[PDB]
Design a protein around this ligand. Structure first.
Ligand SMILES: *Cc1c(COP(=O)(O)O)cnc(C)c1O
Ligand SMILES: *Cc1c(COP(=O)(O)O)cnc(C)c1O
Ligand SMILES: *Cc1c(COP(=O)(O)O)cnc(C)c1O
Ligand SMILES: *Cc1c(COP(=O)(O)O)cnc(C)c1O
Lengths: 456, 456, 456, 456
């Protein structure tokens, strides 16, 4: 019922051009009705992603001025190494320019062809490197996680029965590692309980199976645990995060998310053998282990942001601001995925546009409409992005045809949230007016990135 | 009824420490219950002033990086000179480190001992330099302006009958110049209509009297003209600002206000004789005419800021965010000054605390309570600031005993406004609880700046 | 005989702590006499590498303030794409966090198992990706390039007879592409003449072979052409660079070198098929094609830096400052690699320490001595870095046992060069005093990065 | 004989346009042969002044990012106050936008009409405020200080006999205060010995007279004391500065000089009465005592800069880089003022152009020639700047007809010094070629700032 005011003041702003609706319609047109083809400069509120779109603090910007760009022995690296070792509790750290860079490394080092990798759902880049290195992905998340309507807490929890069964039918020796993600993106940014992580660790530990977290949004997960897990009411975010990682053997992290930066990531591990091997591999892909594809100034900004992310008031507002958007939409009966995750709100384009068939790209059309009416860009996560089968050469028909409204950290206000909520509510009240779309140009690769459409 | 969402995104934020109510009470104690003694770091929302507390843009910060610190011929100066000439339309410009710097200059140049200076109300620093140079200030603002309850538009307007009479009982030749201020600070930030400026210029131009504006908040004034003056509904802010100045002979500007900067100001004029004399005088007070006590980077930032302030959406949201605070307070029956100005909301401490006599400093105590309860700093504008008579050595009893809630530009959100509004409304419901204050230490000079008190 | 003064002024400085010789000796001891283990903060002059250690301009820092961090459609991306298209002349560009990131991409896209890749010498990362993807590297550089004493111009040139013979003995169809590097690192930073680039292109065009440049230091190369190639005396650096690339099908670029930045790189190509395939591949390794693992601000700084690098006076001073260090050392009879390249000076550790056998690591010891005596860090490029055979498990005995003095761009002065030169000349006069080293700890991987030694 | 290398690295550079000699000649022409009219952008090396043209450090730029712009209680002010109290040892400090601002204040507070002000020579701004406030300036520096050819150390010392006599012929009660400047500008930047500061204090103390230091270049002074005063060889710069100020009652400081900043200054004092009165006066001229016309970020940069100036290596290089220029010039027989000061070199235009009469403006023409030949800008300090009498309406004929070459801190290299020294040596060897100048346009005020000339 209550939403907190920003636990910070605005130090500097990014000016935006408020173009008319007539202009937005023309721009949408030229973009082929594909929000991905829109120019950043032509967008008022950009909710395409929460990756690298964060606003830094004055302290981080101060850190950006004292970048020690030395190839080795940089003071910024020591700062990052010390901070991560202190907060995550891992023994070694290898910086990487992004989260995927770390995933490429881990997968090349922890997977042997024909092995299995079990995890609670997946993410495109992380799953790619897994399979790329000869492994078979096995989803062991609870089934309720797949129910977009089920309003249940900790939908990202792993189903221990599915895990135990896997171990039984394939053998511990055949499971490279368990990839536990926090939060679970695919499900809408759903958290994992501390009880589950503890339980999975107990089982895996019994069979000597490795556990690597995809901690890109571990602080948001930390907040849900503090908010909804019994006994964690009075535990600090910092302490919750420390315990979370005490059940993992390492992790891949995208600083571009919860580390409050615009670039940066890293790989963590306790194993010395794996650390030494990782050091040799990072050289050819990211750079020396002393900087890993990151400028010294960026390692400083990331070490600072990680620390800023631990402030309760900051994360509470971050998550509640997303909750605010979901709440407003739910109050008007707009079809969204439940419950609201920590970083975004997903709209059910299917239920939103019942007059359209998935083959008429409702999610893509909804997104286009959202921009023309409010100037906010959202990302289509439906049939268009799902792509079309290689063999049958036909469109994949994903279970969910959604439009994702992803919120960057510390960039928008509740007033901005009202602009997108009011705009979508108005669209919903006249949803029959939303037209279907058709391909006028469909590239072969990355079709969602450059395909152009036209109304049916 | 409707308030616009911020026409910008947050680029960087200023971290703030949220200290408990207990700590705030302790800090206020140590500060002698005087908000002017509180440490900036101990304040959540600082509404002490709108001067130099503005948030700059990414474009301004980029300019901050290309400062041409040359003692002469700096590129930044040319940028500023070109901008001001374009936007204000004046012939010459002399930069100064602050608005007062410009006033000191114009006063030493346009005033002759015994001459008179008429204007709509006054400001401390400006009137000082006026008198300091042997001149008598004559307030020619409409009487209604003095009525804090009269909800009347353009209260800052000049009484043309009060003027004509002045010219009559004293002689044009005895009036140095007319000091028209936009907006009028003393009344609460009230605007002056274009019709008034034009009429004043018509009369003065007749008797050859000089007109110099105090344009510190000329852009807020322009917004009121576009919003409430008939015929300007469709005129651009830029076009309104240009005409405003077409009725003046020069001006003194405080970039710290409407120029969206943290430091800076300038003096403009068309007279070449005055310009040449100004050049000679600036040398000994601010610095060369080519920089006047401002770093190159700051002249660049100010040139950029002035341009940014011309954006309608920006100024509209600026003024409306202040209106929002006023509306919320009025809705709860809190006594405030009417109508709401463009840069601040003034609380009527007299009506707020009817259980306290002015000699118990209601405004001062109201300000201390507001901080201890919400963490927001406000400024007292009553008996404590009015000081005490030199002769009678007794406290001056100002007509209005108010607490000023001044809003910096682009720094806070409506959520922030709700924090100060809900806290003052709650205080009002239990106003009888507010205690009177007493001097435990009263400096002789700048008492309001360092005086310390204690509860009665 | 003449060296030009810096074609720029200092805008900001990086403070350094000048520790004593006693302190430096203690520091060196603690670092196991390995310069790779020294803290950047304990170094006065760091000549470890010219990679990402460059000093940016005020215009570049201004650009760092206007980063459009949008996931797609960023204004900075357009700035970089337009700039590179204009200066390099390639049709398409794909940004990468670094040069290796672009190499990984090109190798995966242009090599098929069993094919051959011919080039003028090689670089560690680039060769790794070549072989990693199933190709056999063939060195076709002129034989003189291997004679470190031969003072001959354009030692980086490709031997057209070696290339023609390759095409003859293996079949044009079996040659993935020709990898022409400018300048040639391994030889000491030696240039490639325009005549050679044109001839190579003529032959390759005949057989339909692909040509991709490893342009990390193409601007330094351009200067040498302007300085020593007949007919280019009056051609602009900008025009020479455009012609160079007119003979290639694409290129991999490390912005960390000649683009005057601390991070960044990119992949260029004219072929649309390859461009489409590269776009799909960059996603999983670097990021969207619209940012490729680089923050928007960095794409802006790299675009600006590339344009700054085209100024003749800047590149002339850059190369000549390196020539200055080499001239001073040569004048004193200190053994170095000839002629001096464009980014570094290589000391011949073998001839420097004739009292030591390569097995006693002369280059590693010379490097430790240079730091203890002057406070400047250099990199060992000899037996330690060469490593030990995997099979025989024995140290590789590289032909050249050197110490590299790599000069960052726009970071040091001639006075700093005098410091390293005078210290090295002094050490040379008592070279017999340099002690041999022995491993006290030899890691299995990246041994030159963390190995620790002790005097013999 | 030996000159130290820069004790810092270049973090960022200010690019410059290297226009040809033909262009420079064209530019000088349009500037009316007056260097004060040249655009900063058309200059290579700007030696107009060392005021506010300094290069800040990466640490200072970091401080610029955390500017606490609160009107009162700013953290940056506490940082500055604490730093000055600690380094200078004074009780109170009142910041001002510039040093003049501090002079204006002190003059108004400590001078009573008719009183006398004695000091070692004078400076324009400071002397003005002295006389403007009804006081007579009495020069009590040693007579040797006026001998531009006398290579005598500590020419800035006060002749104690001249002082004692003053106190005798006028009475201590009639002497406002003693203004001791460190260093002494008018003489060329000459230092005052610690023994003299101690002596003067001992005498003034006896008669209860006041001593205020014009410490704008107190760190350069401190270096000379450490270098040439017996017994201070082993005292830290920090400790020398502390003792220096222990003999004063306060001081006016221009951070634009030795504080390594581009703007800012302050007034120091131990007297509470003066402090309180100073607080009331600053409000109307600079701003609140809590910022005094300075942005929060600038107080931070000044606090950090002051500390950086205390590094022996930095100040030694600073003074020795200027010495280097004087040494090169003297070695070629070029007529300069002796000895070389700590911040500038003065050329003797009279002896430089013996073929010209002061009436033909040799200094002004020399300055013009220096620019057309090298691209460096210098300041005319002869007849043109001396102006012409108000009564007789004729040109004043200053004792010294010089061209001042003032060096900013941390902006140029020795190579830049060679460019100016080599160009001036070449002009000297053909001095007879320097032509006389004649006014083509002479303003009445600030004639040196905008007068235009032409060759006779
Ligand atoms: C964003 C993300 C990653 C890593 O991608 P980044 O761009 O590389 O750093 C990994 N997992 C999840 C669940 C993510 O959301
Ligand atoms: C703030 C203000 C000024 C100028 O003061 P600043 O600090 O000097 O620049 C002048 N007039 C009014 C009405 C003001 O509100
Ligand atoms: C530096 C370099 C590269 C690319 O490496 P970076 O770190 O990745 O960008 C490629 N080739 C040569 C010859 C280089 O010197
Ligand atoms: C520079 C200087 C001052 C002060 O002038 P600034 O511009 O105001 O701060 C005072 N005295 C001397 C001797 C100076 O050199």
């Amino acid at each position: 019922m209550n939403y907190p005011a920003e636990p910070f003041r605005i130090k500097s702003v990014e000016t935006v051009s408020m173009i008319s609706r007539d202009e937005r319609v023309k721009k949408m047109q030229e973009a082929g009705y594909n929000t991905f083809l829109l120019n950043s400069k032509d967008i008022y509120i950009d909710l395409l992603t929460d990756s690298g779109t964060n606003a830094m603090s004055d302290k981080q910007w101060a850190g950006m001025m004292i970048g020690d760009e030395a190839y080795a022995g940089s003071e910024n690296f020591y700062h990052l190494e010390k901070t991560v070792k202190e907060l995550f509790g891992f023994k070694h750290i290898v910086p990487t320019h992004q989260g995927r860079g770390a995933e490429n490394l881990l997968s090349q080092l922890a997977i042997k062809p024909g092995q299995y990798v079990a995890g609670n759902m997946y993410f495109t880049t992380t799953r790619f490197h897994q399979e790329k290195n000869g492994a078979t992905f096995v989803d062991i998340v609870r089934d309720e996680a797949h129910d977009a309507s089920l309003n249940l807490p900790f939908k990202g929890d792993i189903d221990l029965n599915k895990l135990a069964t896997l171990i039984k039918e394939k053998g511990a020796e055949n499971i490279a590692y368990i990839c536990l993600a926090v939060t679970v993106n695919l499900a809408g940014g759903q958290p994992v309980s501390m009880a589950n992580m503890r339980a999975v660790h107990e089982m895996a530990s019994t069979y000597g199976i490795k556990i690597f977290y995809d901690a890109t949004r571990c602080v948001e997960n930390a907040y849900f645990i503090k908010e909804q897990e019994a006994g964690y009411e009075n535990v600090s975010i910092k302490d919750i995060v420390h315990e979370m990682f005490s059940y993992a053997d390492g992790c891949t992290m995208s600083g571009k998310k919860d580390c409050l930066v615009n670039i940066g990531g890293f790989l963590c591990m306790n194993d010395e053998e794996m650390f030494s091997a990782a050091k040799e591999l990072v050289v050819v892909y990211e750079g020396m282990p002393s900087y890993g594809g990151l400028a010294g100034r960026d390692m400083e900004a990331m070490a600072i942001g990680l620390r800023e992310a631990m402030q309760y008031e900051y994360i509470e507002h971050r998550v509640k601001q997303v909750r605010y958007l979901g709440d407003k939409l739910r109050e008007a009966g707009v079809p969204i995925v439940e419950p609201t995750g920590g970083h975004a709100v997903f709209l059910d384009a299917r239920r939103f546009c019942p007059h359209l068939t998935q083959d008429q790209f409702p999610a893509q059309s909804l997104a286009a409409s959202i921009y023309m009416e409010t100037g906010v860009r959202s990302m289509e996560r439906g049939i268009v992005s799902a792509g079309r089968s290689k063999e049958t050469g036909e469109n994949h028909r994903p279970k969910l045809e959604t439009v994702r409204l992803t919120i960057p950290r510390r960039v928008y206000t509740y007033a901005h949230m009202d602009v997108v909520a009011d705009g979508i509510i108005k669209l919903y009240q006249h949803k029959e007016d939303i037209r279907g779309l058709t391909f006028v140009y469909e590239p072969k690769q990355l079709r969602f990135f450059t395909a152009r459409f036209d109304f049916i």
